[PDB]
Amino acid sequence: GSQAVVTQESALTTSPGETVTLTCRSSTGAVTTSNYANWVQEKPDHLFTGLIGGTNNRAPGVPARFSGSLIGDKAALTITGAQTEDEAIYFCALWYSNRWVFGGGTKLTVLGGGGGSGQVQLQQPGAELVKPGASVKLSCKASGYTFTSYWMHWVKQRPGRGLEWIGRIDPNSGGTKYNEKFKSKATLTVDKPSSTAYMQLSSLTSEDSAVYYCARYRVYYAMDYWGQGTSVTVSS
Numbered sequence: 001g002s003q004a005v006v007t008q009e010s011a012l013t014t015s016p017g018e019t020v021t022l023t024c025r026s027s028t029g030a031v032t033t034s035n036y037a038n039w040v041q042e043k044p045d046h047l048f049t050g051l052i053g054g055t056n057n058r059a060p061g062v063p064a065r066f067s068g069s070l071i072g073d074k075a076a077l078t079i080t081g082a083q084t085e086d087e088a089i090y091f092c093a094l095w096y097s098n099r100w101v102f103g104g105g106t107k108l109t110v111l112g113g114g115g116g117s118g119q120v121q122l123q124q125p126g127a128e129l130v131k132p133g134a135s136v137k138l139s140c141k142a143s144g145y146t147f148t149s150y151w152m153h154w155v156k157q158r159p160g161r162g163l164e165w166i167g168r169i170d171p172n173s174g175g176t177k178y179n180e181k182f183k184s185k186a187t188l189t190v191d192k193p194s195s196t197a198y199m200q201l202s203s204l205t206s207e208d209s210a211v212y213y214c215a216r217y218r219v220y221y222a223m224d225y226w227g228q229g230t231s232v233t234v235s236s
């Protein structure tokens, strides 16, 4: 498609009880409702959870202090009354016609002590080891919801580096959509009996060494629930 780049504040510092606004900028112009801005939180030990999707739709269970909107020419995530548990990295994802593009993440620091305001599962193997040229098939067991009513996304993360969207599958149809970056490198499959989604990475290389996440998605909403990620390493 294009060479779109999504930009966020590198860092923000707040205190418990303050209102902080994280923004998400598009290098192609203004962020629009057609970019269906998603917001995803990364807590220590690489625990990802979706907060907002489709600009302003609230993922399930997300606290009332979080809200999403367009402010001027950017998407915005607003925390009205930050709490110490909100210290984390916040990623925004924008839809560019045929692919999701992640920003670089905002590291939110909450300084000082404070108070504040106090089922689905996706299971992924911890690691999978492979030598160059071989193939790995990655599993993502879904539990707690109707498997076919929700899309599945896969995301690649080279630690210390950004997030890359790989592709999506609709379990009710098998209809797929792949990032052109991975169109022949990866194939998404689903086993409705065992309610399990799979990804096969044919003919690996050294770049393919990264953690691979699966993430459930309800269209027009958020990439809410994320697997723990499978750290695929390549012998070298």
Ligand SMILES: O=C(O)CCCCCNC(=O)Cc1cc([N+](=O)O)c(O)c([N+](=O)O)c1
Pocket: 036, 095, 097, 167, 168, 177, 219, 220, 221
């Ligand atoms: O199916 C329906 O009911 C309606 C669906 C389209 C309307 C809402 N669009 C999105 O949420 C953003 C998005 C659009 C896609 N598209 O429409 O091409 C995708 O393929 C895709 N993805 O993740 O792959 C993500």
